[PDB]
Design an enzyme around this catalytic site. Structure first.
Site, PDB file in Angstrom:
ATOM      1  N   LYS A 130      80.959  48.649  50.997  1.00  0.00           N
ATOM      2  CA  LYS A 130      79.737  48.468  50.226  1.00  0.00           C
ATOM      3  C   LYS A 130      78.697  48.274  51.272  1.00  0.00           C
ATOM      4  O   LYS A 130      79.037  47.881  52.370  1.00  0.00           O
ATOM      5  CB  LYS A 130      79.821  47.285  49.240  1.00  0.00           C
ATOM      6  CG  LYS A 130      80.241  45.959  49.844  1.00  0.00           C
ATOM      7  CD  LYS A 130      80.466  44.942  48.754  1.00  0.00           C
ATOM      8  CE  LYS A 130      80.202  43.533  49.192  1.00  0.00           C
ATOM      9  NZ  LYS A 130      80.441  42.635  47.988  1.00  0.00           N
ATOM     10  N   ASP A 157      83.429  43.481  57.902  1.00  0.00           N
ATOM     11  CA  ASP A 157      84.088  42.626  56.908  1.00  0.00           C
ATOM     12  C   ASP A 157      85.462  43.120  56.499  1.00  0.00           C
ATOM     13  O   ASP A 157      85.634  43.712  55.425  1.00  0.00           O
ATOM     14  CB  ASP A 157      83.212  42.443  55.672  1.00  0.00           C
ATOM     15  CG  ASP A 157      83.632  41.243  54.819  1.00  0.00           C
ATOM     16  OD1 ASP A 157      84.740  40.658  55.015  1.00  0.00           O
ATOM     17  OD2 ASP A 157      82.871  40.805  53.934  1.00  0.00           O
ATOM     18  N   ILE A 216      73.178  33.116  60.084  1.00  0.00           N
ATOM     19  CA  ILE A 216      72.900  34.459  59.612  1.00  0.00           C
ATOM     20  C   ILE A 216      73.765  34.828  58.388  1.00  0.00           C
ATOM     21  O   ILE A 216      73.799  35.988  57.946  1.00  0.00           O
ATOM     22  CB  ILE A 216      73.042  35.470  60.798  1.00  0.00           C
ATOM     23  CG1 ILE A 216      72.345  36.800  60.454  1.00  0.00           C
ATOM     24  CG2 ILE A 216      74.507  35.650  61.237  1.00  0.00           C
ATOM     25  CD1 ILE A 216      72.852  38.000  61.242  1.00  0.00           C
ATOM     26  N   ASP A 256      86.876  47.181  50.576  1.00  0.00           N
ATOM     27  CA  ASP A 256      85.627  46.546  50.152  1.00  0.00           C
ATOM     28  C   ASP A 256      84.456  47.209  50.808  1.00  0.00           C
ATOM     29  O   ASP A 256      83.626  46.544  51.409  1.00  0.00           O
ATOM     30  CB  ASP A 256      85.664  45.033  50.470  1.00  0.00           C
ATOM     31  CG  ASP A 256      84.649  44.212  49.636  1.00  0.00           C
ATOM     32  OD1 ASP A 256      84.251  44.656  48.525  1.00  0.00           O
ATOM     33  OD2 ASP A 256      84.224  43.109  50.038  1.00  0.00           O
ATOM     34  N   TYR A 273      85.170  30.761  53.508  1.00  0.00           N
ATOM     35  CA  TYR A 273      85.896  29.854  54.452  1.00  0.00           C
ATOM     36  C   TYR A 273      85.076  29.367  55.643  1.00  0.00           C
ATOM     37  O   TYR A 273      85.634  28.773  56.577  1.00  0.00           O
ATOM     38  CB  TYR A 273      87.236  30.423  54.967  1.00  0.00           C
ATOM     39  CG  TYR A 273      88.023  31.110  53.879  1.00  0.00           C
ATOM     40  CD1 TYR A 273      89.050  30.444  53.202  1.00  0.00           C
ATOM     41  CD2 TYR A 273      87.687  32.407  53.476  1.00  0.00           C
ATOM     42  CE1 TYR A 273      89.743  31.063  52.179  1.00  0.00           C
ATOM     43  CE2 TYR A 273      88.362  33.025  52.450  1.00  0.00           C
ATOM     44  CZ  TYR A 273      89.391  32.351  51.803  1.00  0.00           C
ATOM     45  OH  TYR A 273      89.995  32.915  50.888  1.00  0.00           O
TER      46      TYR A 273
HETATM   47  N1  LIG Z   1      79.092  41.011  63.722  1.00  0.00           N
HETATM   48  C1  LIG Z   1      78.016  40.766  62.939  1.00  0.00           C
HETATM   49  N2  LIG Z   1      76.772  41.123  63.335  1.00  0.00           N
HETATM   50  C2  LIG Z   1      75.689  40.888  62.571  1.00  0.00           C
HETATM   51  N3  LIG Z   1      75.740  40.287  61.368  1.00  0.00           N
HETATM   52  C3  LIG Z   1      76.922  39.863  60.837  1.00  0.00           C
HETATM   53  C4  LIG Z   1      78.157  40.088  61.622  1.00  0.00           C
HETATM   54  N4  LIG Z   1      79.173  39.588  60.894  1.00  0.00           N
HETATM   55  C5  LIG Z   1      78.637  39.092  59.748  1.00  0.00           C
HETATM   56  N5  LIG Z   1      77.295  39.248  59.696  1.00  0.00           N
HETATM   57  C6  LIG Z   1      76.403  38.814  58.564  1.00  0.00           C
HETATM   58  O1  LIG Z   1      77.149  38.119  57.552  1.00  0.00           O
HETATM   59  C7  LIG Z   1      77.231  38.878  56.335  1.00  0.00           C
HETATM   60  C8  LIG Z   1      78.679  39.166  55.929  1.00  0.00           C
HETATM   61  O2  LIG Z   1      79.626  38.841  56.963  1.00  0.00           O
HETATM   62  P1  LIG Z   1      81.209  39.066  56.711  1.00  0.00           P
HETATM   63  O3  LIG Z   1      81.217  39.954  55.490  1.00  0.00           O
HETATM   64  O4  LIG Z   1      81.892  39.515  57.986  1.00  0.00           O
HETATM   65  O5  LIG Z   1      81.764  37.572  56.368  1.00  0.00           O
HETATM   66  P2  LIG Z   1      82.198  36.970  54.912  1.00  0.00           P
HETATM   67  O6  LIG Z   1      81.212  37.434  53.855  1.00  0.00           O
HETATM   68  O7  LIG Z   1      82.363  35.475  55.095  1.00  0.00           O
HETATM   69  O8  LIG Z   1      83.642  37.663  54.561  1.00  0.00           O
HETATM   70  P3  LIG Z   1      85.162  37.195  54.945  1.00  0.00           P
HETATM   71  O9  LIG Z   1      85.075  35.763  55.434  1.00  0.00           O
HETATM   72  O10 LIG Z   1      85.933  37.353  53.656  1.00  0.00           O
HETATM   73  O11 LIG Z   1      85.623  38.186  55.990  1.00  0.00           O
HETATM   74  C9  LIG Z   1      76.456  40.179  56.534  1.00  0.00           C
HETATM   75  O12 LIG Z   1      75.535  40.449  55.455  1.00  0.00           O
HETATM   76  C10 LIG Z   1      75.751  40.021  57.876  1.00  0.00           C
HETATM   77  O13 LIG Z   1      74.335  39.848  57.687  1.00  0.00           O
END
Ligand SMILES: Nc1ncnc2c1ncn2[C@@H]1O[C@H](COP(=O)(O)OP(=O)(O)OP(=O)(O)O)[C@@H](O)[C@H]1O
Lengths: 257, 296
Positions: B129, B145, B10, B127, B15
């Site tokens: 958004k 996030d 998803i 952050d 990382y």
């Molecule tokens: N708990 C959750 N429930 C549903 N979707 C999620 C969830 N966590 C992350 N996502 C999905 O992943 C995307 C962004 O996740 P998140 O921003 O937490 O991780 P990231 O972009 O890898 O950031 P970082 O690793 O720097 O915290 C969102 O657009 C969402 O669709």
């Protein structure tokens, strides 16, 4: 003052939760208060060499003390714990933390990088990732807003004395950061100006000069005996003009409490 | 990791990957965030250390719930409650039906509750958004996030300048302020508020300079009357064009007088005069707040 009261109340709660065991050294079959003193003084020096924040140092000592509350450490590993803790405090607190190779370099090759990386992970697991600890420095920063007007010598001297507390587990482990901070501020104020723990801070913290007295008694002693302590890096640090040379100032002979 | 069954990928970040997964034993649907550890080089990523430790302190119905951290020698997996989609995806899917005002207001009330909680527990999100805000099937929205969050101190000190996504980036940061605090997150939610309403980005600048020009074109070029200390900011320029502020009736037409008033307080130039999340919750705009379920 946006969330100043909400934040303070929450820190007061959190310091009790991140509190190390007061009696842990006697339970460490192989390490001592004196060894711990050496470790922190060295971390103070790492902190100066790498131009690290003061809060990073304070965070690292909390991390060390909590780890040593939970695990027996042999004396040849005491420094591996301190390095990983400085490393995790750096990642948490710094905009530009040193990289891991620098952490290995400072131990002058006592340990490998893998050792330092595995210890980091062991330390996270032992703290269950609870890293956002309130520090003496956090409480002092809040207290400084209750000056009129802000006095730079008072602030540097308060920091100096809060930092000396980091070195001696006996007796500082029995006090809460907010309490050491209250002692540090009053004593620093009283030493520069002659003034005393302001009524605004009594209303804020609910700490009076009497409740601050045991700590204040200890801290005054530490202030008096500082030139003759085995560990000296904090004094040398606080002679720099960066800290307005406040470790070259003379402690009062009495407090009048 | 055995109790968990991957359902679909998803997401992806710097990382590692994000998964919808299901607890085989309890039937619970979760999000798994996989974080690779640099076992031979840098260890546990500093962004994961802040994100885990900050999120563990933050237990509020409008902040994504971190349920567990599963360690291995070579990976971390953060287990999060599963939330249907992000606000950006929901706005996009709502191109032809629009978003009901009561849904916009409920969402904003919730984001501000989530946000007041963070700030109360000395955490800046840094952050905010639409991509980072998560909705469920039932009408809730949550801050997510926490990768760029940090624990602050009172008074703040100099924190990382390269922080907020440009469209959401407060003018004090753009003018290279030494110090930013809670006010930067209120700015971003102000931008999000108008975007829920118009469903297009309030200020989609091309660069820092252009970002400022866009803000000034709408809110009027700041001066010392409106913002004591602007002209003495490091990246301030006396040659900035002097634009007159537009009517909010034109910036956010569907918005009533209450909403306009709130948006305007959230988007105040002087960070000190910009409203707190705490205070915003008391604004008349929220007198009639409900909690609609979105059409999904
Ligand atoms: N708990 C959750 N429930 C549903 N979707 C999620 C969830 N966590 C992350 N996502 C999905 O992943 C995307 C962004 O996740 P998140 O921003 O937490 O991780 P990231 O972009 O890898 O950031 P970082 O690793 O720097 O915290 C969102 O657009 C969402 O669709």
């Amino acid at each position: 003052p946006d969330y100043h009261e909400d934040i303070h109340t929450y820190l007061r709660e959190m310091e009790v939760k991140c509190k190390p065991k007061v009696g842990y050294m006697k339970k460490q079959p192989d390490i001592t208060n004196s060894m711990r003193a050496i470790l922190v003084d060295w971390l103070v020096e790492v902190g100066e060499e790498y131009k690290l924040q003061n809060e990073t140092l304070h965070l690292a000592v909390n991390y060390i003390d909590r780890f040593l509350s939970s695990m027996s450490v042999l004396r040849g590993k005491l420094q591996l714990v301190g390095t990983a803790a400085m490393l995790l405090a750096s990642k948490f607190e710094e905009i530009y933390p040193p990289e891991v190779a620098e952490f290995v370099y400072i131990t002058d090759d006592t340990y490998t990088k893998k050792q330092v990386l595995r210890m980091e992970h062991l330390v996270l697991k032992v703290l269950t990732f609870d890293l956002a600890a309130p520090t003496v420095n956090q409480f002092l920063t809040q207290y400084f807003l209750h000056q009129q007007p802000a006095n730079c010598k008072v602030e540097s001297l308060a920091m100096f004395l809060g930092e000396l507390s980091l070195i001696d587990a006996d007796p500082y482990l029995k006090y809460l950061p907010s309490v050491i901070a209250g002692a540090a501020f009053h004593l620093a104020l009283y030493t520069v100006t002659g003034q005393s723990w302001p009524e605004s801070l009594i209303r804020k913290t609910g700490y009076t000069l009497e409740s601050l007295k045991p700590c204040l008694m200890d801290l005054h002693q530490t202030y008096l005996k500082a030139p003759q302590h085995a560990q000296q890096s904090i004094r040398e640090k606080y002679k720099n003009s960066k800290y307005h040379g406040v470790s070259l100032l003379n402690p009062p002979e009495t407090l009048n409490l | 990791m055995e109790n968990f069954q991957k359902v679909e990928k998803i997401g992806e970040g710097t990382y590692g990957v994000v998964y919808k997964a299901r607890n085989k034993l309890t039937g619970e649907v979760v999000a798994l965030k996989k974080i690779r550890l640099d076992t031979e080089t840098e260890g546990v990523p500093s962004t994961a250390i802040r994100e885990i430790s900050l999120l563990k302190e933050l237990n509020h119905p409008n902040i994504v719930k971190l349920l567990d951290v599963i360690h291995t020698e070579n990976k971390l997996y953060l287990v999060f409650e599963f939330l249907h989609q992000d606000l950006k995806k929901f706005m996009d899917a709502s191109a032809l039906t629009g978003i009901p005002l009561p849904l916009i207001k409920s969402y904003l009330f919730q984001l501000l509750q989530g946000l007041a909680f963070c700030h109360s527990h000395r955490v800046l999100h840094r952050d905010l958004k639409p991509q980072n805000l998560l909705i469920n099937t039932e009408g809730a929205i949550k801050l997510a996030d926490f990768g760029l969050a940090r624990a602050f101190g009172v008074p703040v000190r100099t924190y990382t300048h390269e922080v907020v996504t440009l469209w959401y980036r407060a003018p004090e940061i753009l003018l290279g302020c030494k110090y930013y605090s809670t006010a930067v997150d209120i700015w971003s939610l102000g931008c999000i508020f108008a975007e829920m309403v118009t469903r297009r980005a309030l200020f989609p600048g091309d660069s820092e300079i252009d970002q400022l020009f866009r803000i000034f074109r709408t809110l009027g070029t700041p001066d010392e009357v409106v913002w004591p200390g602007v002209t003495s900011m490091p990246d301030y320029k006396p040659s900035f064009p002097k634009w007159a502020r537009q009517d909010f009736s034109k910036v956010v037409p569907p918005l009533d007088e209450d909403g306009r008033s709130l948006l305007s307080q959230m988007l105040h130039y002087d960070p000190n005069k910009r409203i707190s999340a705490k205070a915003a919750l008391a604004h008349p705009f929220f007198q009639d707040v409900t909690k609609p379920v979105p059409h999904l």
